[PDB]
Structure formats: structure tokens, C-alpha cells
Write a protein that holds these residues in place. Structure first.
Motif, PDB file in Angstrom:
ATOM      1  N   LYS A  62       0.836  -1.133   0.036  1.00 15.26           N
ATOM      2  CA  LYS A  62       0.165  -0.011   0.077  1.00 15.26           C
ATOM      3  C   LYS A  62       1.025   1.156  -0.032  1.00 15.26           C
ATOM      4  CE  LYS A  62      -4.244  -1.920   1.727  1.00 15.26           C
ATOM      5  NZ  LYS A  62      -5.163  -1.034   0.822  1.00 15.26           N
ATOM      6  N   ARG A  63       0.403   2.404  -0.851  1.00 15.79           N
ATOM      7  CA  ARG A  63       1.274   3.454  -0.927  1.00 15.79           C
ATOM      8  C   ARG A  63       1.144   4.208   0.477  1.00 15.79           C
ATOM      9  NH1 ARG A  63       1.035   5.902  -5.997  1.00 15.79           N
ATOM     10  NH2 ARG A  63       2.743   7.526  -5.940  1.00 15.79           N
ATOM     11  N   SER A  64       2.552   4.562   1.035  1.00 13.04           N
ATOM     12  CA  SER A  64       2.559   5.087   2.303  1.00 13.04           C
ATOM     13  C   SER A  64       2.969   6.455   2.371  1.00 13.04           C
ATOM     14  CB  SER A  64       3.692   4.393   2.989  1.00 13.04           C
ATOM     15  OG  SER A  64       5.180   4.522   2.630  1.00 13.04           O
ATOM     16  N   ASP A  65       2.909   7.224   1.187  1.00 17.89           N
ATOM     17  CA  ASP A  65       3.348   8.592   0.658  1.00 17.89           C
ATOM     18  C   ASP A  65       2.933   9.084  -0.487  1.00 17.89           C
ATOM     19  OD1 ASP A  65       4.533  11.055   0.999  1.00 17.89           O
ATOM     20  OD2 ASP A  65       6.535  10.168   1.750  1.00 17.89           O
ATOM     21  N   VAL A  74       6.126   2.377  -0.054  1.00 15.90           N
ATOM     22  CA  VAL A  74       5.036   1.621   0.245  1.00 15.90           C
ATOM     23  C   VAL A  74       5.243   0.788   1.654  1.00 15.90           C
ATOM     24  CG1 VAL A  74       4.568   1.084  -2.238  1.00 15.90           C
ATOM     25  CG2 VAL A  74       6.124  -0.632  -0.692  1.00 15.90           C
ATOM     26  N   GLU A  75       4.356   0.358   2.104  1.00  9.41           N
ATOM     27  CA  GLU A  75       4.436  -0.734   3.423  1.00  9.41           C
ATOM     28  C   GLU A  75       3.244  -1.869   3.140  1.00  9.41           C
ATOM     29  OE1 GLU A  75       3.562   1.854   6.754  1.00  9.41           O
ATOM     30  OE2 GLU A  75       1.797   3.044   5.585  1.00  9.41           O
ATOM     31  N   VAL A  77       0.442  -4.494   4.470  1.00  8.98           N
ATOM     32  CA  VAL A  77      -0.743  -4.472   5.282  1.00  8.98           C
ATOM     33  C   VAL A  77      -1.262  -6.220   5.046  1.00  8.98           C
ATOM     34  CG1 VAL A  77      -3.002  -3.862   5.397  1.00  8.98           C
ATOM     35  CG2 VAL A  77      -1.109  -2.420   5.161  1.00  8.98           C
ATOM     36  N   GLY A  86      -2.710  -3.428   9.876  1.00  9.17           N
ATOM     37  CA  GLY A  86      -2.050  -2.332   9.359  1.00  9.17           C
ATOM     38  C   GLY A  86      -3.155  -1.311   8.772  1.00  9.17           C
ATOM     39  N   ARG A  87      -2.624  -0.167   8.419  1.00  8.10           N
ATOM     40  CA  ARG A  87      -3.363   0.962   7.878  1.00  8.10           C
ATOM     41  C   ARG A  87      -2.342   1.921   7.112  1.00  8.10           C
ATOM     42  NH1 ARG A  87      -4.769   6.456   9.331  1.00  8.10           N
ATOM     43  NH2 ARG A  87      -7.161   6.315   9.042  1.00  8.10           N
ATOM     44  N   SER A  88      -2.806   1.896   5.710  1.00  7.62           N
ATOM     45  CA  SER A  88      -1.957   2.591   4.722  1.00  7.62           C
ATOM     46  C   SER A  88      -2.880   3.081   3.580  1.00  7.62           C
ATOM     47  CB  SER A  88      -0.879   1.683   4.469  1.00  7.62           C
ATOM     48  OG  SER A  88       0.283   2.322   3.385  1.00  7.62           O
ATOM     49  N   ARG A 112       9.276   0.534   3.421  1.00  9.77           N
ATOM     50  CA  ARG A 112       9.634   0.732   4.721  1.00  9.77           C
ATOM     51  C   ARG A 112       9.740  -0.637   5.284  1.00  9.77           C
ATOM     52  NH1 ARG A 112       5.087   4.155   7.489  1.00  9.77           N
ATOM     53  NH2 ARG A 112       6.096   5.470   5.767  1.00  9.77           N
TER      54      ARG A 112
END
Length: 113
Positions: A62-65, A74-75, A77, A86-88, A112
Motif C-alpha cells: 500500500k502507498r505510504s506517501d 510502500v508498506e 498490510v 495495518g493501515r496505509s 519501509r
């Protein structure tokens, strides 16, 4: 380093031989991270009918920024029976083991770690 530049092979869902990382949220996140580190991780782009063809628990990137050197940050989930750990941001795809399937593309990510 807190982040690692990776180029993930994008696989067609019907080519994928190993359709998940394991049997618990904690195992699939563990295995996904190990495969990402070892360069043995592929990405399947999520569209209608893809996820029912893969094994839960799922691991998403998931795109983190809102993207250094072309690499989207990304991070991970995980998801099991409709609950996410997780939440992203927006899903770039679902991770799977890569065991030599031919990709259709590469997805440059900054993971990350």
C-alpha cells in the motif's frame, strides 16, 4: 536502512504457482518480508476476480506517501477474513512468492523495512 529500493516482478494471477506466503497474518507478513529481502517476491495487480484466485491471508503493498528515484514508498498490510492488520494508502498489489514465473512488468517501490 529503514527503506530499501526494490523492483518487483509483476505476475499474471493465472501464472502464479505459490499463491500465498502461509497460514497466519504474522507468518505471511514474516515470509513476505523475507522474500522481499531475498529478491524472491512477486506482485499481482488487484482487479475483479484476482483475490479469490489467491490464498488468504493476503499481503498487500500500500502507498505510504505521495516517490524517490521513481520508487513509490510502500508498506505491508495483511488481510484475513475481511480484517486488515495495518493501515496505509492505496493498494499497488498483492505479494506472492516468485519461483521463476515470467513477469509482464516491474513495479519500482521503496519498502519501509
Amino acid at each position: 536502512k529503514t527503506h530499501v529500493q526494490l523492483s518487483l516482478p509483476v505476475l499474471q494471477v493465472r501464472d502464479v504457482l505459490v499463491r500465498g506466503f502461509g497460514d497466519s497474518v504474522e507468518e505471511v507478513l514474516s515470509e513476505a518480508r523475507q522474500h522481499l529481502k531475498d529478491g524472491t517476491c512477486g506482485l499481482v495487480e488487484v482487479e475483479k476476480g484476482v483475490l479469490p484466485q489467491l490464498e488468504q491471508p493476503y499481503v498487500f503493498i500500500k502507498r505510504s506517501d505521495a516517490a524517490p528515484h521513481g520508487h513509490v514508498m510502500v508498506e505491508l498490510v495483511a488481510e484475513l477474513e475481511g480484517i486488515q492488520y495495518g493501515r496505509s494508502g492505496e493498494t499497488l498489489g498483492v505479494l506472492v512468492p516468485h519461483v521463476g514465473e515470467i513477469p509482464v512488468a516491474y513495479r519500482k517501490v521503496l519498502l519501509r523495512k
